[PDB]
Amino acid sequence: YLSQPRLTYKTVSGVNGPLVILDHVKFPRYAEIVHLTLPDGTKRSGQVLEVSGSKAVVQVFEGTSGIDAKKTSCEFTGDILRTPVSEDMLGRVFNGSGKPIDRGPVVLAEDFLDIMGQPINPQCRIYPEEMIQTGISAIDGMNSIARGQKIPIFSAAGLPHNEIAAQICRQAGLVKENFAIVFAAMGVNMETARFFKSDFEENGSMDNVCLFLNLANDPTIERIITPRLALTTAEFLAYQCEKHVLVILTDMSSYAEALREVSAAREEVPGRRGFPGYMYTDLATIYERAGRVEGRNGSITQIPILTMPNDDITHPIPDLTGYITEGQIYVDRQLHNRQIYPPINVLPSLSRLMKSAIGEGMTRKDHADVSNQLYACYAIGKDVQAMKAVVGEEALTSDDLLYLEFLQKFEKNFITQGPYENRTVYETLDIGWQLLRIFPKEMLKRIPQSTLSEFYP
Amino acid sequence: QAAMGSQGNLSAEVEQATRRQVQGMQSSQQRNRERVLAQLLGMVCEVRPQVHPNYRV
Amino acid sequence: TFGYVHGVSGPVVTACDMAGAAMYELVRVGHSELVGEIIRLEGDMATIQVYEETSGVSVGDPVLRTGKPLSVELGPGIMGAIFDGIQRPLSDISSQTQSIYIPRGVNVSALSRDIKWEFIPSKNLRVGSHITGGDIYGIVNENSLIKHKIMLPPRNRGSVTYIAPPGNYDASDVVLELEFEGVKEKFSMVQVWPVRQVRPVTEKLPANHPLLTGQRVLDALFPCVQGGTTAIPGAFGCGKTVISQSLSKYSNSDVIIYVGCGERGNEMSEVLRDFPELTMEVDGKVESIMKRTALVANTSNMPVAAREASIYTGITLSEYFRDMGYHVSMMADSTSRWAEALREISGRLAEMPADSGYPAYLGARLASFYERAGRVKCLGNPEREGSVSIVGAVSPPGGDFSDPVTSATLGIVQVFWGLDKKLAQRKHFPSVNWLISYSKYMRALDEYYDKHFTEFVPLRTKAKEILQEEEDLAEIVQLVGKASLAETDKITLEVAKLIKDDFLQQNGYTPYDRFCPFYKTVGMLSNMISFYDMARRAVETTAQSDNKITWSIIREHMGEILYKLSSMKFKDPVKDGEAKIKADYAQLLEDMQNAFRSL
Fold first, then answer.
1. A277: which chain C residues are within 8 Å (Cβ-Cβ)?
2. How many independent structural domains does chain A possess?
3. Structural domain boundaries enclosing A116
4. Pick from A122, A157, A145, A319: which is nearest to A248 by CA?
5. For the CA atoms of chain C, what is the radius of gyration?
6. Which stretches does UniProt call biased (Polar residues) (chain B)?
7. What is the CATH number of the domain that holds A216?
8. Is C344 buried (19+), middle (13-18) or exposed (0-12) by CB count in 10 A?
């Protein structure tokens, strides 16, 4: 418990870009938070990046401007960045830095928590095994959302991903709760912000949503701290209260842009496409806050949303996001040009947790096999369509006709879907069997004999 | 008219609930005001002089 | 003496007043005891990389020095547990703190100081004899599956003075006392070793025994050898982790050390959950496989500097067990992560960069690490033959093979298992690009096949040629459609397609294909090649006759037989005898013969 007075400084020995170098600081602390006063009446804040001798370096979370080397002052609280947090943050809307904008009072905290968190010991974390129903056939039928995973959402500019997030958070449930939502927005258009707000207000679950907002007009550097704060709040509600919290992030690409800018200001080692060399580590730090823990019944699920600059996949952001997370749900503009309300290209949409949440006891023994068979058949459909594109209709064979028929009916039924429907898993499986019945019995080479001897007819 | 009746009623009960809550809130506040103040004043009076652990001679 | 923290920046810390320091000495920084190593000296200043997250460190904080370089404590109690990047048992820490988080400066003993161990001294150990290092002087049945041996650490020699009698002993109890030149010294069942020093050997020996993998693809076409080395590059989602898991589960080795550096901890949870259940049969006993495996883990979110330490610790343990007289393999996961750590540390030092921003000595470090492999005649009078195999996994950004990390690793290893993203996209789950893959252990292995499975040798060659010929046609098929090729060509294409769909494909998550014994693979390939050559010869012999057998005729004749040949893969290694499946293959072959002769 600190009881000493703060220290105040006016020794502004230099400035360069978004950094300010002080001199003659008495025992400065790494990662110390500092307030300061501009010559006019406003006030700002910052964080210490490195220390050397009596010199110190700080970074202003909201851009440097008009700071005077003679007039301004500084204030060394002597502590690492720590946030207030309480259960009552639910129902409340904050901007960056947690400042209220819903016209309530300051945050009256139950506890003060370190922002940076701590790693979870792998020994004492339980592997997720429960299956979250979702009501979209492209997800449940041929992938799997499990309580505890962190699958992201690949998307492109203009494509309709926001309502996909709205739908998944609208009708979440368990196959046979609360799902306190925490929704952090990093540099996004006002339109999407109001869209999400209206959707949650329509859903009527406003008692269970804590919001963080950051428009693109807000200061650039704020975005690096924006998501960690929301994740800390979610962690509080997940572990100290054993709630099931779902988390959604809007734009990781904006966070990457903020990070590249900060690193370039300091002239650090560049890797692929002008990124910081260590962006992998930070993406790991943000993404790794997930999965349930021994002895507590809470849970943390993450569905971050990130935007490839274009259709390229080898761009470093989506690549490293694939490296960290255990799968991904792809969205293709091609389907959007054909007006299929879920534009989910099932093919590149691999998820890794279909193992332990599928089979007897959970859904049925035949789920994995039908999904694999559908993969194979859809793939052959793509290939024969490619062959059609070059050779012509009349050079094909009966098998090609069957595969084209399967492709057409699959995209017509399995994927195409209503905005407000709610399909159960068993209905999805029935649809899959209907699709499978198009092929003869003998062409189904991905299914064991034991399963088709019972389910094929 | 059915919706208007329902909403007027609901506004009435929720206002009742809030007034009850704040009243009970004040009732809880009034009984535990002196102890906290004694604690804060005691902390204020405490000094515990010290120097930085890093100081050198 | 003691230094002081001149400056901090990321995971690097400059300390003044360090005149007596030396390179690669352990140090402690902060009021908490944060372990680190020295990496640069300049006059009285020094440079320290720290293995803990750096935050809340003041200037002028005291710094302690110790002459011991980085080392690991070696002895019993290792298996069945888990450690951090440096030797720190996580389970003991979690029981000590009763929490969820690792304390920033936790410091606990590497091995327990309270567990008791039975002991049996050697039957030839007499007072006054000489062992001069490397000799086993006692046995400890640490676990029913594997028995821990204790031998004199190298660089030690002298007559025998005291011998502990048979019985039970706790750590640090005097086991053996030795007298050389009027100097007495005592040893226990735990010792120490620097991590970066190569353990000496009597001699390196050539590879002479194959190391199976339990995959029809790898064993058949691109085999690896016991004591050898390899690498597995490939983009994300190509199932490298799955291959590592399969190898760890169903190898021929005694002990397997799995070093996971920079990955999801959910993989560690999977290993913790699955392995205890599964059981394996040796010595007429069934034991949970955790007894024969040790696990070193370093989650991605942990501090960057510890990752090199983890890679070194793993191979040090593998070395210690190779000295013991066992064959062991290793699963080094994502060494590119180690490269990344090197990149960061060099970045904070303002060192001149090399290609792709990596330090210059990346190649040297990788070569030094991978050189440690190989079969070994060990030190000691009771000769044993051990071996170490390293199965590395690389993760090149972008999915190509242009990064210096991969190219560097190609120049060292002997076996290469490329993976291709499109194949894993196909749900051809063991996505091995046979075209690019290759192995340089084809020689020094033909004797094994000649002694056991002599027929396999032509068979695999034939299959390889067929695959190559399929590829050599496929482009011209793609450019110009069918109906412009002879019967032999389409026949070869179709049989190659069925090879692709059946033999190469292998789903290890169904209960009946988790593992494929070698003889099953041999029989499958034999049946395939027999059918192929029979069909080809049959159609060839009728080329100039009045009725040319085409492929459609063959299909009409043998559709059901092809279906049975496809379903051939449904043979469970358990719940179905070896004899019955072999007889089934023979009976199918006879059926194929009858159907051919009838035509």
1. 340, 343-344, 347, 357
2. 1
3. 1-457
4. A145
5. 29
6. 1-10, 19-30
7. 3.40.50.12240
8. buried
